[PDB]
Structure formats: structure tokens, C-alpha cells
Design a protein around this ligand. Structure first.
Ligand SMILES: NCCCC[C@@](N)(CC[C@](N)(CCCCN)C(=O)O)C(=O)O
Ligand SMILES: NCCCC[C@@](N)(CC[C@](N)(CCCCN)C(=O)O)C(=O)O
Ligand SMILES: [Mg+2]
Ligand SMILES: [Mg+2]
Ligand SMILES: [Mg+2]
Ligand SMILES: [Mg+2]
Ligand SMILES: [Mg+2]
Ligand SMILES: [Mg+2]
Ligand SMILES: [Mg+2]
Ligand SMILES: [Mg+2]
Lengths: 296, 296, 296, 296
């Protein structure tokens, strides 16, 4: 299978006067490229996919594709939806506009059965010829892609090559790779990046890397080179920021941190997201003081 | 406050050849009207809101409004979204096209904070002048509207008049009505309709009533009249069907039951929803046997 | 079946200088009798059954039996254990020493299967000829007595007559009484006393009644007479204290309130239970001012 | 600090005609010694601590001590209780009778606060001068020893040297060793032995090692020697058996396997534990056949 692995960033989507700040977006992506990242994920959960229109979503995929040209950095385009016809449309767009693969979140809110998830992802995978990474985040979607369903999809569809796990369930990560060791398990939970990598995970799709791209890429690359001692070191050092970036619902803290670091111009969300409490603002600012944040 | 209460049905959306079966939809609504239902909810969770387009969602709201004209039956239009700008667009549409009020589910997938939920619903309520019923279903959305948040919205926004609770949490139902007894608490969970009504709930938004409208309406009207012995007897009789209708994710069982009863022509969903297992199909058919199903 | 129902109190066990304060225990029981309580439960969870020796447990049952003689008040003796041979010993002691029935908590820590729970309670029920009330509290025991197992035990063992439920699950309470309406469902969760009683539950085993026995007794008897307006009003009034009495693990808050009320001499627990935090101490003190607390 | 780490076994307790089969108990330990195990845990959860009397509990500690005498293998005696005065008595007994250290499970059923857990373990640690390993298993006890509480106890009581974690929470394992890398984190959950060890955990207290001591000891020793490749390979091979040994509550499956393998003479439990279902019996037998089970 064609794969997209290594250190990856779930890019925040900056807003200015309620519109996507397209120049800021390209600048943030170039900062990722210059700090050792292997791929970027436009419009994942961290990019506020829910509140972008289908047009803004497509614009952000294009900006990512254009910005990574002339580099090794791949674009793993966010293309999931809880409606299969929407997810297929996003997948075809990503392929036709030069994305290297797609991320595809489990349908949220309508809770498909395992049979429905299989049919959902088969339809998506049959619509394009580029790699497809599943994405399990049950605390947000209300559903779980079972290990058996992930393995069946991996074996039955040529371009489905792995899963981003954001489930806080290392037992499930053992289950996945013990029964199907050819799949690419990708960490979607920064605090446990190293444990997932040490069990044979092959990359991360990170929130923290928005702020600290050099640290996440170093951790991932150490782990892939089997220097687990140094990968663990960075994972342990990052624990405090990894946790504080979820003191409120992601991406509220990471955008707060990017704004405090001077990396975006305004602390702007689209409703229903909004600024953190005054207390959590101060907590984020305090934890940032322990880390060295790269500029542009 | 202006209110919409009593026995209400979360309408299924019949599909045929992949499109909304508009005639069948109108006929199903007339069957509800003729069996004592007080309001209908087009395009809630049970109506597959996630997989309809915005144009089909609007078409179904229009069909409900047109079908209920000249009757006592109200239209409480499904209008929620996880993007506040989409939820405002749906609310304004419902108002402008003659809905009696709106239902508005808590944002799914993006997990807003309590402050964000407040701003989300404040924006929706300020955009129209018709009643707004909040809708809490944390197992599907990944977030919970707290009792404090519900009460503040009820007190701060003129048109927000209560909440549909689908959280299996009778403690919260006590919390709500003990601290704010003027709100309209509505059961969103058929198996516990009677406990919610007996604590001062004023209506239900039912899945089971799709199949058994006369029984749910009777349960509710007995309960509102304080004939608790008779309301409890029906709630107890309905327990088996109320639960089997969730053997797989709603609306897969209720549509399966409607098809088995001959009330819709095709057992069609939109992916990622799909037919139940062969085992659950048989369980649904077996439980239906002990209930008397009204035809057209 | 012989039954023990109505308003019942899970008695605290007062300590002084590390020993059971026997005189105080009898005094507290007399106060319960004089305030309309129908039964007292010595050495349940609220009575710190875990940290009493087998001898003290037996002393406390004996004091309760002595104190209720010549009154209408029954003794439903705490007799549970996670070891069946221990639970049978307590059951036989309770019978031989004149208890009217026994409460028997689901085995904690060792998590028996449903078959194991069935055989456990069958062994207990076969060992005595007095009423046995099962007791389900999964948040504390780590196991659940399923509705099917409760009903099988009720139907198969002639002295098992119902269940004390402390599970926050009104759906299960409907399930229980819809399939086996002859059993006595007893509320083990003060905040939802009224919803359980209004669904056909027949009593409460209360924590709050230690402090406010007259109010819990009135609620229960109103509800048993289907005077639901008055029963719900008291349940609503009691909600704030019912919840604050679990700001820390029961019985830490209720013992704190009894001490603040001047009903016991010293705020004494047996480790690992201990005095509450300073804030929760003040929180308990503040909610108490809203209620009228009977003296001796 | 003095420590007890490496590959350890939570010994089953065989029964014969309802009594501890002491001669089989010693033989099982000797088989563990012969297969590379570093320490044995008499009368933990897997040893049915709940249903042994205090005297049987003590007898099993004595057998372990005597059996391991003159060998390199240590005895980490189960000494926990939900009553602090009982846990202190067991701790002192183990010290006085030659145990190398004690395991002490968090109090079950009575749900102490974090302050209570601290005082509980401080009382135990101060009663002896041998190493004390905390033991967190919230699914069984109903309480959690927080990371902050574990770390304070480790830093404040010289003999407290680590924690056996059975919580399915690799994030917490990162939290623990990132903030206190000096403690000995011990896996109490066989399926995730390797991820816990790969993050710096220093041993396992295993259920599976009862049946396959050579495989669990090898897994642990590869990981301690930083051969993560081979430690993960064994962890992956063992996943199927590691999970099936919990198809019913531990130790119901492990005793069933020990009996099927001819290693214990009778499949006897003490109520409320009992034989597994016929189906689960069959599943266990089927999974065991894929592994090489050492004899005596
Ligand atoms: N990524 C850009 C599109 C975002 C659209 C949407 N807000 C809503 C998606 C939808 N399937 C739309 C249904 C509209 C008719 N009710 C949903 O809300 O479920 C989401 O997926 O979160
Ligand atoms: N109610 C008075 C007796 C209380 C005894 C005990 N503390 C411990 C019960 C026990 N079965 C004792 C096991 C002793 C041998 N390890 C347990 O701890 O599980 C409890 O049940 O909570
Ligand atoms: Mg640009
Ligand atoms: Mg996606
Ligand atoms: Mg009437
Ligand atoms: Mg004791
Ligand atoms: Mg009367
Ligand atoms: Mg030997
Ligand atoms: Mg122990
Ligand atoms: Mg265990």
C-alpha cells in the first residue's frame, strides 16, 4: 500500500474578521515544513472542519497543497463527514486537487453500526486512488470503529492503510497491531504519542505540533529510528503542554497558545467555539513558559 | 413563554430510490395527526438530519407545515447544527416558512464549552421570534448542556422554553425542574416517558410513536391529566418495544419496524446508516407482534 | 411474600475514642422512630460496615433490634459481604437475634458473574426464613445485579422480595417493575426518591433521613398514597441537601452534618474514611441552614 | 528505596474439598520459580483474597515464603484491605513472617477520598520496614488513587516504592513516570504489559503467568534489557490469551485454564465466584491450545 506516515500536524485554521485568514494559513504551514514535519492535515478536528463551509474547507486543502509544493511534506487532507455522500465529495476533491491522501473521521452524531461504517469507508475508498487513513475519536463522534472493522477495511480496500486513534485505549492499539501488523497506526492523542509509537505506531497527527513542531517531529523521528530512550524523553517533557492543550475542548487551547505566542493575529473562533475562561487562559499561558516556541 | 408540549413524534424520513419520498412523508404525518399526536418534529435525529441536504431538510419542514395546516397539530421543526451559522439559517427558514417552533440539538462532534453552548443558543434564539426547545443527547453529540446552562438560557432568552432530554439521567430531570419549575422538560427517551412526565415533564418527542402513535399519545394525555396509573400502565406495556427500537442505532430499528408493518414501501437509509442485522430484524419483528399497529 | 417497605434509614454508626458509641447509636435510632420512619438499617454502607469488626457489626444489629421493640419500626439488618460464607453468617445472626429482615449488598471487589450472584443470594436466602432485600450499588461494588438476575432471584427464592437500587438508572427501574410488578423496588438514592416511588417503588433506604427523618418519611408516605404533588415538592426541596451529602463519599458528609447539627459528639470515622475538606465542610454547613433539623 | 520488581505472578489459590490445597499451592510456586519468575504475590485479587479467612490468607503467605526460601525469588505478599486496621494487621504479619514486601490494594467498596487513601497507606507504610507497592484497580474498588496521591505517598513514606496499575490508562502511566521517574510502575494488566514496560515500567504482576510463566518472564526480561522488538513480539503473541483470561471475572478464567492444563486437581472456587459458562469454558480451551504450556 501507499502510505503517509511520520510526524503530522492537524493544522489550526486561523480566522480574521470571521473569514479564513488565507495568508496566515500558508505562513503557519510553511513554519511546519521548516521544523521537520512530514505531513500536514488541513481541516481535521483541530482545523474546525465543522464550522467551515464546504468552500472554505476546499480552499484550505488547496492552500496546503500549494504551500507544500517543492518539498517532501505531504498533504493528508481532512475529508471526513457523517454523511457518506459528503465524505465522497470531499475525497474526490482532495484527489482532483493534488492531495497525497485523505484523513476520514468516523461519522459523528448518527452512530452508524459496524456494517454501516464498513460501507461508509468502502464507498469513500472506492471513489479515489489515493491513500485513506481512518480516524477513530469516540469521545467526539459517539461511535467506535471496532478493531475488526478497521482490519477488514484495511484488508478489503487497497488504499485504506491505517487509522488515527484518539481513543485513550492502548489495549486497542495492541489489539490492532497484534492481529494486523501491516497497518499504519497513527497517534491522534499527543500525551501518549510515545507509547503508541513504541508499540509499532508509525506516526502522529498532532495538536501540540501546531505550537512545538520541532519537538513533535524530533520525538516521532527518534521513535521511528528506534531511539526510544530519546523519544520518551521528549514525550515526558511534553506531557504538561500536551494535557493543558485539552483543558478546554480542542482547538480552543491550541489557538489560545498560538495567539499568546504571537503566531496568529487574533484569538478568533467560529461559534459554537469561543475563547477559554479567564482561568484556563492563564493556565495555558503559564504552562507555555516552560517550552521554547519557534517563530516564523 | 409560548410553548409546544404534549405528545410529539420525531418523524422518520422515508426514502425511495435514494430521494425523500415526499408523498409517503405527508401520509405518515397525516397518520400521526389522526392518532392524537400534538406536534410533529421533522428532521430530528430520527429523521436522518445528518444525511439530508440543506434543501431536502427544508423540503421536509415545508411538507410538515403544509400537512398540519387546519389541524391542532404543531410543527416543531428540527433546526440544530454543530455550526451556529447553519443552525441560525435553519431557524430563520423554519420561522419564515410557518413552523410553530424549533428543536435545536446540542452541537455534535466539536464539543463546545458551556459558554459556547450559551452563545450558540443565544444566537439562535435571537434570530427568530418562535419557541426554541433545546435538545440534549450527550451519547450522540459528545457534549452535555449542563443544568446551569439550560436554566440560564431559559431565563435569559425569551423564546427558549425547555429541553428535550435524551440522557438517561433522572437525577438531572429532578435538578432541572426543582431549580426552574417553569421550564418545559420533554422526554427524548421513550422507555422513561412516564418517569419524566410524573416529575412534571410536559411532553415527549418520541421514536416509538412513529409506529404506535395512539399509545404514546394516550400515555402522554393520561399523564398530563394526572392519571398516573394509566400512563404508567402504557409505559410498562411499551417497555419491550421501546427498548428493541434501539437494538441498533435509531432510526435503524424504527424504520425496520415501519417497513415490516407496511407503513413505508422501502427499507432504505442513507449511508452511513443501513439495514439491521438479520438477527435484529427478527427480534424487531418478534417484539412487534404483541402490539396493535394502526394502519392508514 | 413477607416484606419490609416504607421510609427507612441507613443509620450512621457514631464513634467515640475509636469505639462504637453504643448509647449514641440507640439515641439516634429512637429519634428515627419518633419522626415517622418505618424501618432502620443498621450497618449498611452508610453505617461503615467495611471498617467494623464482625463483633461490632453484630452489636449494632442487636442495639437496633432492642431499640425497636414495642414499636411499629422494623429492623432490616445490614448483612452483606463479598464472601458468601461471611454473608450467610451475618444473615443467620440477624435472624437468630430478632431482625425483621436483611439487606444484602452485591459482593464488592471480586466481581462475581451473574451466575455467581444468583448462587450467592440463593445461599443467603436459603439460610434464613426472614425477608431478604437485594442491594445494587455498582459504583461502589464494581458489579451490577442485572434485571434478569434480580427477577430470577425474586421468583425463585421465596424470601427475596425486592432490591435497593443505588444505580442512577430510572430505565432499569422501569424494566424491573414492568416485567415483575410484585417486587418491592426501594430507592437507595435520595435525590431520585420521588421518581422511583412514583413508578411504583415502595420505599426508600435513605442517607438524608439520618438528618431529616420527618421530611423523608413525609415524602415516602405522600408518594405511597399517590399524593404525588406533595411528595414531589418535598423531593424538590430536598434536592440541594441530597446532592451536597455526596460532595464527598457517603457517609463523610452525612456524619459531618450530624456533627454540625449537634446529633453526634465527635466527627469521627474509621480509616480509610476521614474528615472532609475545609471547603466541603463549609458547603455542608451552608446547605444545612436551609432546612429545619429535628433534635432529640 | 528497597524494591521488588521484574516478572511477578498473582498466584491462584487452588481449593480441594473447599480447603486451600497447600501441597498444590507449593508445587505451583515451585513451577513459577523454575520458569524465570522474579517474585510471587500470594493472595492478591487473582488469589481470591476476599473469600479466604484471615487465617487462610496468612497460611498462603507462609507457604510462599517457605517455598521461595533459598531461591532468588521474592515474596510480595498481598496485604490490602478496605479497613485500615485490617490492612495494618496483614502488613505486620507479612513482615513478621519473612515476606520481602507487600502489595496493598486501594480500599474497595467504601470509596475513601484522596486524603483518606493517603492516611490509609501512610498508616500501613509506617507499620513495617519492608517495601510497599500500591495497587490501583478502579474497576474493582470503585476508587482511584490519583497520580498526585501516588507521588506524594512515594515521596513522603520511605518504604512506598511504586504502584501496580490495573486501570487501562496509559496516559496515567505517562503522567506517573514523567513527574516521578524514580517510582517503580508495575503492570497489573497483561494485555498491555509491553506498553507499560516500554514507557519505563519495571515489572508485571501477572495473571497470565500462572499458565505461561516462561512467556511472561521472557517478555519482562526482554523489555528490561531494552529488547523492545522481542518484548512486543511476545506481548502480541499473548494478546489472545491475555484477553480470554478475562472473558469472565479474573480468576475464573485462569483457574479454568490451570485445570484444563492438568495443573490443578479441581476446578473449585469459593462463592460468590463459580465456574464459567459452558461457552466461555470452550473459548478458554480453544485459545489455550495455541500456546505451549510448561508442565511441572
Ligand atoms: N467540512 C465542511 C462541512 C461541515 C458541515 C457540518 N457542520 C454539518 C454536516 C451535516 N451532515 C449537514 C446536514 C445538513 C442537513 N441537516 C450535519 O450537520 O450532520 C459538519 O460536518 O460538521
Ligand atoms: N462488616 C464487618 C466485616 C467487614 C470485613 C471487610 N472489611 C473485609 C471482608 C473481606 N471478605 C475479608 C477478607 C479477609 C481475608 N483477606 C474482604 O476484604 O474481602 C468488608 O467486608 O468490608
Ligand atoms: Mg494563501
Ligand atoms: Mg476527517
Ligand atoms: Mg382530560
Ligand atoms: Mg472490620
Ligand atoms: Mg394515608
Ligand atoms: Mg525450586
Ligand atoms: Mg492487596
Ligand atoms: Mg483482576
Amino acid at each position: 500500500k501507499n502510505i503517509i506516515i511520520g510526524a503530522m500536524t492537524a493544522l489550526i485554521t486561523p480566522f480574521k474578521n470571521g473569514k479564513v485568514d488565507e495568508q496566515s494559513y500558508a505562513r503557519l504551514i510553511k513554519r511546519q515544513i521548516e521544523n521537520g514535519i512530514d505531513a500536514v492535515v488541513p481541516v481535521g478536528t483541530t482545523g474546525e472542519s465543522a464550522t467551515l463551509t464546504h468552500e472554505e474547507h476546499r480552499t484550505c486543502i488547496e492552500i496546503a497543497v500549494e504551500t507544500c509544493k517543492g518539498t517532501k511534506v505531504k498533504v493528508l487532507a481532512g475529508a471526513g463527514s457523517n454523511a457518506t455522500h459528503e465524505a465522497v465529495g470531499l475525497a474526490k476533491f482532495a484527489k482532483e486537487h493534488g492531495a497525497d491522501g485523505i484523513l476520514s473521521v468516523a461519522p459523528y452524531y448518527n452512530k452508524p453500526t459496524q456494517q454501516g461504517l464498513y460501507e461508509h469507508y468502502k464507498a469513500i475508498a472506492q471513489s479515489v486512488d489515493i491513500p485513506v487513513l481512518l480516524y477513530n475519536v469516540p469521545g467526539r463522534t459517539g461511535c467506535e470503529i471496532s478493531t475488526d472493522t478497521i482490519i477488514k477495511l484495511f484488508r478489503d480496500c487497497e488504499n485504506i492503510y491505517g487509522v488515527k486513534e484518539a481513543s485513550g485505549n492502548i489495549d486497542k492499539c495492541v489489539d490492532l497491531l497484534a492481529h494486523e501488523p501491516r497497518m499504519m497506526l497513527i497517534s491522534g492523542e499527543d500525551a501518549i504519542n510515545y507509547p503508541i509509537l513504541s508499540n509499532g505506531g508509525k506516526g502522529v497527527i498532532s495538536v501540540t505540533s501546531n505550537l512545538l513542531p520541532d519537538m513533535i517531529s524530533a520525538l516521532t523521528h527518534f521513535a521511528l529510528d528506534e531511539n526510544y530512550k530519546e523519544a520518551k524523553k521528549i514525550n515526558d517533557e511534553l506531557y504538561n503542554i500536551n494535557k493543558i492543550l485539552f483543558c478546554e475542548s480542542n482547538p480552543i487551547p491550541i489557538k489560545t497558545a498560538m495567539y499568546l505566542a504571537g503566531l496568529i493575529e487574533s484569538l478568533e473562533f467560529r461559534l459554537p467555539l469561543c475563547s477559554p475562561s479567564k482561568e484556563n487562559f492563564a493556565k495555558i499561558e503559564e504552562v507555555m513558559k516552560k517550552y521554547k516556541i519557534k517563530g516564523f
